[PDB]
């Protein structure tokens, strides 16, 4: 069986494809690879060895052909503007493919909870009430993500074919594991650790619902095999960690534990902190993937939270650049040369 | 046989084989080495005064 | 011995490398690290 995902040199797509390749169709329903095909963000990138496709840019005819070739298709539009327009073209041409279809084919779009930023709760007083795959219908926008929301809704317009053709979209919490860019930046900070206290932003008490790339991949396969009868699903952890907890944990394990809360403007200076990432720093959200949690027979990495799994997550990150500490003694006479060479 | 060495009273040394064998080799080398190097002097007892 | 003696007299001034100290420490260094036994032996038993 054959599946597409775009921009596999993003960790978000890439590691999902990696794990999705190793799994087996239908297996998710229980408690040899696929064929996986993908686009690259960067001409610098090269085919991931779990994947076999090569297109530094693809012919739109070629794309539509391979979109027919796959048993299921997922797309992701986080960060990338162009992926939105391309997915819209894909789903429109796919409307023709619905007439062509060998079978009812599956489409999926990957999206973030950040869409929910500007939300009145259902209970603005009991601010701890959670929201679910039912609620996103509500999701009060954020501006770029509102165009993402538009593409999502259009994808459901085509989705209406349902029994003839399936479309799906998913809201992901902050993404963690696999060198995930924000945590990578905070990993990088603590790895150097040069400040005696690590920075924290305004309140920081904002909860950031989150998913780990492997567990998201499992969710994606579960959706594919189930073909769930609600065409949007949420991908977030029970962690319910505030950002304050996230940074406290990071500094405690890697850093000095010492931490400082500072105007977000002080963070704005930073290079890899795109405005998207700063927005992720801004958001509080409170949601639980009840539909997934009932339906989906995932063998988790862990259902719990980043703060708990932190040791494993750090181990992953350290492998991600192999930064295993180097550890030496050299023996003999003293001082001159010996110390000199050691310092060299 | 050690008890026989009692009866003769010959020299006996023992060394432990559990270290990596080149250490053991160095050790028995080191102990034998005086005996060989001295050997020109068989007995040659001498007296500070 | 040559390198040490070639160290500046100012540099060696009162140091552990003043020739008496240097000689004694050099001997002590050898005397500890018998081929019968050295600190290396611990790592050798770890086979690292």
TrEMBL record, chain C:
UniProt family annotation: In the central section; belongs to the adenylate kinase family.
Organism listed in the record: Mus musculus (Mouse)
Function: Nucleoside monophosphate (NMP) kinase that catalyzes the reversible transfer of the terminal phosphate group between nucleoside triphosphates and monophosphates. Has highest activity toward AMP, and weaker activity toward dAMP, CMP and dCMP. Also displays broad nucleoside diphosphate kinase activity. Involved in maintaining ciliary structure and function.
Location in the cell: Cell projection, Cilium, Flagellum; Cytoplasm, Cytosol
Name the UniProt record assigns to this protein: Adenylate kinase 7
């Amino acid at each position: 069986q054959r599946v597409f995902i775009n921009h596999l040199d993003t960790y978000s797509s890439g590691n999902i494809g990696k794990f999705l390749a190793n799994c087996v169709a239908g297996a998710s329903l229980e408690e040899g690879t696929f064929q996986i095909v993908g686009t690259l963000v960067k001409p610098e990138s090269v085919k991931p060895d779990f994947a076999v496709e090569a297109y530094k840019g693809i012919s739109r005819e070629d794309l539509l052909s391979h979109l027919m070739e796959c048993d299921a298709v997922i797309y992701n539009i986080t960060e990338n503007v162009q992926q939105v327009e391309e997915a819209l073209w894909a789903v429109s041409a796919l409307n023709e493919e619905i007439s062509h279809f060998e079978k009812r084919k599956v489409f999926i779009l990957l999206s973030t909870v950040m869409t929910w930023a500007r939300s009145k709760p259902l209970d603005p007083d009991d601010n701890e009430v959670p929201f679910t795959e039912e609620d996103y219908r509500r999701r009060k926008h954020h501006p770029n993500f509102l165009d993402h929301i538009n593409a999502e809704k259009i994808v459901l317009k085509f989705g209406k074919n349902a029994k003839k053709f399936a479309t799906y979209v998913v809201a992901s919490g902050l993404q963690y594991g696999a060198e995930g860019g924000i945590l990578h930046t905070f990993f990088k900070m603590a790895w150097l650790g040069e400040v005696p206290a690590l920075p924290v932003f305004g309140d920081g008490t904002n909860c950031i619902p989150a998913i780990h790339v492997v567990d998201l991949a499992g969710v994606i396969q579960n959706i594919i095999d189930h073909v769930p009868k609600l065409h949007y699903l949420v991908a977030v952890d029970e962690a319910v960690h505030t950002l304050e907890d996230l940074v406290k944990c990071i500094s405690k394990n890697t850093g000095p534990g010492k931490i400082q809360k500072v105007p977000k403007e002080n963070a704005f200076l930073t290079k890899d902190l795109t405005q998207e990432y700063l927005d992720h720093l801004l958001v509080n959200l409170r949601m639980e993937a009840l539909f997934v949690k009932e339906n989906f027979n995932i063998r988790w990495v862990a259902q719990t939270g980043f703060v708990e799994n932190i040791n494993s997550i750090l181990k992953e990150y350290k492998q991600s650049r192999g930064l295993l500490p180097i550890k030496i003694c050299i023996l003999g006479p003293p001082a001159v040369g010996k110390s000199s060479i050691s310092e060299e | 046989i050690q008890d026989e060495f009692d009866k003769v009273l010959i020299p006996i040394i023992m060394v432990n084989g559990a270290r990596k064998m080149h250490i053991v080799q160095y050790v028995m080398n080191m102990k034998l080495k005086p005996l060989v190097e001295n050997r020109e002097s068989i007995f040659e007892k001498c007296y500070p005064v | 011995k040559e390198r040490v003696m070639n160290l500046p007299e100012s540099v060696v001034a009162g140091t552990h490398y003043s020739q008496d100290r240097f000689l004694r420490s050099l001997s002590h260094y050898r005397d500890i690290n018998t081929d019968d036994e050295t600190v290396f032996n611990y790592f050798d038993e770890l086979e690292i």
